[PDB]
Design a protein that fits this description.
Blueprint (H helix, E strand, L loop, with lengths): L4 E5 L18 E3 L8 E12 L2 E6 L9 E6 L6 E6 L20 E2 L11 E6 L4 E10 L8 E3 L1 E4 L5
Antiparallel strand pairs: 1-3, 2-10, 3-9, 4-8, 4-11, 5-6, 5-9, 7-8
The structure holds calcium ion (2 copies).
PDB class: carbohydrate-binding module
Keywords: B-sandwich, carbohydrate-binding module
Assembly: monomeric
Length: 159
């Protein structure tokens, strides 16, 4: 069994381990704006029955995903939807300074104590998926912001 790690991304980053370190306060920035079809891909380090997936950022984070799918895979061949973000249509520049709450994210007080109150997240629940890899797939460009991840949280961080 191995620690999770980044295996592919559309752009360089300021420390990819920070997305999967189990610490909702540490965050990685991917240092560019996404285009349709771009991905960020992590190895989970072992096969896991994924019941719950959360993508967490701060509740004011402007570098949140606006249009994309967070997907799971067991084999690197089939990717299965877990979380849908946005409508798949490019947002305008008017959305550049929006918080994640403007784009359908939940606030931490909705999380039953799992996500801090000052943070926002999207979630897939009751997923019933076996997985070894997780990715963000961008379904539209957003030229005005980069991408930050505080955590891709698996099964609420349980053992
Ligand atoms: Ca983190
Ligand atoms: Ca959109």
């Amino acid at each position: 069994v191995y620690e999770p790690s980044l295996v592919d991304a559309y752009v360089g980053d300021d420390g990819a381990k920070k997305a999967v370190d189990g610490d909702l306060k540490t965050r990685v920035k991917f240092l560019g704006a996404p285009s349709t079809g771009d991905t960020i891909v992590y190895d989970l380090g072992q096969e896991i029955l994924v019941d719950n997936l959360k993508y967490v950022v701060l509740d004011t984070e402007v570098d949140h995903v606006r249009d994309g799918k967070i997907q799971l895979s067991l084999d690197g061949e089939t990717w299965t939807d877990a979380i849908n973000i946005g409508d798949g249509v490019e947002n305008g520049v008017d959305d550049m300074f929006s918080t994640p709450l403007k784009n359908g994210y939940k606030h931490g007080n909705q999380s039953g104590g799992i996500v801090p109150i000052d943070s926002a997240y999207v979630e897939g629940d009751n997923l019933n998926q076996k997985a070894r890899y997780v990715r963000i797939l961008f379904t539209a460009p957003y030229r005005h912001r980069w991408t930050v991840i505080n955590e891709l949280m698996i099964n609420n961080g349980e053992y």
